[PDB]
Ligand binder design. Structure first.
Ligand SMILES: CN(CC(=O)N1CCCCC1)S(C)(=O)=O
Length: 185
């Protein structure tokens, strides 16, 4: 792909984070803590899952960023509407305002309803995410495999401003403590 020149500097919004997350001082990394991180509750925090939003809002144009997923067993990545549900249980779907892919139990899937199997020969250590607001496209790229395409959501109906979306995943196994990291431009 040749989307690299639309690179944007994403930072994480602490106020949206689940209360167990630890976001680095530079707001570029996030990991699961082993306990509640001693913050007040608010209506923006994702309550049931270890999720956090980027601070940036996009309503036009072309945007690109990269995320490091090295040695994680589970995670979700993509974009979502600014007005997605924060509290309780929900599925990641375009009907609920999410355009995402994930790793779970040794398989990769796109967050359609129902979910779609992905075909990845080289497990990625970094993921590229491209959004074309006007075209209604969200695409995912395997940076470890020379930028190969993972998945394209087309005919997207965003229906609002978009925010970068992250889930570090649960750490029931003791094998999923590693962080998500926003990679430098
Ligand atoms: C289920 N987790 C503990 C927990 O209750 N929380 C952390 C995750 C978000 C909800 C809050 S664990 C064992 O760390 O994956």
């Amino acid at each position: 792909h040749h989307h690299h020149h639309h690179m944007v500097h994403i930072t994480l919004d602490r106020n949206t984070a689940n209360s167990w997350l630890i976001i680095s001082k530079d707001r570029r990394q996030v990991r699961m803590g082993d306990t509640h991180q001693n913050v007040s509750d608010n209506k923006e925090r994702f309550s049931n899952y270890p999720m956090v939003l980027g601070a940036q809002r996009f309503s036009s144009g072309k945007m690109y960023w990269e995320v490091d997923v090295t040695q994680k067993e589970a995670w979700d990545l993509g974009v979502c509407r600014d007005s997605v549900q924060r509290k309780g249980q929900f599925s990641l779907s375009p009907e609920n305002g999410f355009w995402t892919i994930w790793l779970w139990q040794d398989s990769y899937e796109a967050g359609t309803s129902p979910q779609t199997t992905l075909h990845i020969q080289v497990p990625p250590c970094q993921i590229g995410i491209f959004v074309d607001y006007e075209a209604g496209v969200v695409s995912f790229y395997n940076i470890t495999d020379h930028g190969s395409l993972i998945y394209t959501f087309s005919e997207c109906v965003f229906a609002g401003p978009l925010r970068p979306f992250f889930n570090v995943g649960f750490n029931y196994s003791g094998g999923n403590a590693a962080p998500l990291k926003l990679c430098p431009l």
